[PDB]
Amino acid sequence: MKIKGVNLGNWLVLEKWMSSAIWEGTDAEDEYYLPRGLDSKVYEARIKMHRAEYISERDFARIKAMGFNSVRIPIPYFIYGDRAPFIGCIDELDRAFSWAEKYDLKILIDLHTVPMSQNGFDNGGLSGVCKWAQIPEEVDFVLNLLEKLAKRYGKRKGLLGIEPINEPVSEEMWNDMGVQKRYPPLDKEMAEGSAPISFEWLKGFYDKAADRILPNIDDDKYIVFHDGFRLHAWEEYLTQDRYKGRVILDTHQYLMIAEMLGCEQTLEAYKTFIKEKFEDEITKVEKYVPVVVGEWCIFNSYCVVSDEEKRKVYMELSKAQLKAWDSLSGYFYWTYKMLLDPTNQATWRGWDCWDLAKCVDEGWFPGRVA
Template sequence: MATLRGVNLGSWLVLEKWMVPSLFVGLAATDETTWCVELGPAASERLRAHWASWITRDDFVWLAERGIDLVRIPFGHWVMGPPYPYHPKYGENPFPFVPGGIEVIDQALVWAETYGLKVLLDLHAAPGCQNGFDNGGMLDVCEWHTQTEYIDFSVELLGRIAERYRASRALWGIELLNEPRWDVPTAILLDYYRRAYDAVRRHLPPERAAVMFHDGFRDWREYLGALPAPEYQNVWFDVHRYQCFTREDLDADIFEHLRKTAVDLRQEADAIRATLQLPTICGEWSLGLDLEVVSLWAEGPFNHPLEHLDPFQQEVAIRAFAATQLLAFERYDGWCFWNYKTETTPAWSFRAAVERGWLPPSFAANAYPSLD
């Protein structure tokens, strides 16, 4: 099976302030929940304008022309409109989110089918938030696993998503939950994954679509035998590998990052594929080595591996980092770069990285002559 080469379409249906700071200018909001609550009735026009401009048909054309196979589309639990579970952060309005996101997905699937792209729909922000990150919808709140209502709604929503897109030829798979935090108990997570799998499979049999689950920031060995065949089929495992969020990575020089990628991450990929025996994707990775541009709330110091290199050396280093990661993640069954675009830093923008020559100009299998 050929490696799936993909790109995330993040900050489209789940806002992340660091990627689209222009939408947050003058606001106290830190995430989509507080953005919608703070703006109130004014949120609708502004967000719909963002939906219409952030990703367009032309972007699908651009990706297809460069040989990309897959787009991973993050969405929030509010995507199909109310009702959805209440959280105290919503204040007096029980349904603060702008409706209409589901029509954006409808259109994305049409574009994907037109231009030959596969789509992975990813529940990125669950009720109560599953990780406490802004990408989970509510910064510093991690309560998804604490209320049955939140978990039950997530299962039911994925069933509705599967039913809605059961006939879509572009739908490749559904990811059950993005990045549940490391302290969400594994037993709760696995029970949810099994229930959500069943909800999706009621409408999408294994031959029609993949079902994907994230590692939840824990050792992949915890999932050995957790979703066994033949009861569970066409199940994919998702890992995310970044190198700018720990003090160890920020203090390391570029040579250590290249070694870590070429040795440690390659060995991890080979071990997961050999032992877990589930098709696996590195669903998020980037060229980011600088924490300051990614997290608008992280505490310093903001040293990073490229800061003492001159501009030529920085250029060589980031190309080497890109190539080494690509070689490592090609050991998996697929990968998806985070993100397609940003307003802020090209190291996190697939399009900018391609246009600057940090990433290859084409990802099509037949784009390059053999070196033989």
């Protein structure tokens, strides 16, 4: 297994900072309140134009042409069209499969947002609220959703696997990042009583999730489990007999961590950090379970310095993490595509390196990975 992939972020699951247009004329900071700021047929007009244009068949041609073999698609919990006022998108996921299959790529369905949130991040669609795991109606809703998805796509040539939930927040991650001030909740009584997800609760959910997914995918498809911000906690759970051959662990590893643990801002300092804290640490896990780094990027504060030297540094950092990732089972860049305007929004300069495809064109990332 050498999974080489990109994420299709901001496509079916919005993240505000990556495109401004759909948000204009509203005060909404996340997916949940966007329809609450717009006439319903304005909201449907923007949503349908966005999904139509942001990802289309030409982008799967590009991804294959750059050397990747997989894509990871964050999808929302409302994807079947059954949770108003949000708009379903099963058709977009159907066609993405048809495009993956044409270009001999495979798709990891990543269930990225759940009713009432599993992290409280704006990424999760509802800022400052984190109550999905406390509501057994919505946990069961998600379990039915993964079952319908497994039965829909489980035999498709283009299915790599299914990730039952992205980034379920842990007790340490919840208190350390002060989630509910970073992402302020708009409805303060909706927010109160949010709680993080304990490891033992997550393991039970994964049990139930495997009950719905594994019976319904074919024997060569995978279930992909996020590490719940507990990279090293999964050896006992993932080496059970029912999982042998059938599971990948997903860990999200962001280079920007290095400067907040005080890496000197040199190339060689950064690549010692990549070798020692990324490669040397994550391969311990790969000893007993396949690990894909399903979110990483090349963002870094040194590059935020001439244009040429920032090109040199990005390229080295890209190549440095790609060599780290070759001793694992694979990676998915975050992300394929953004609609950032660093030319005219000066504060976003240094942030367009989250757009994988633009990196390739700027000479920040190798043109081919295979």
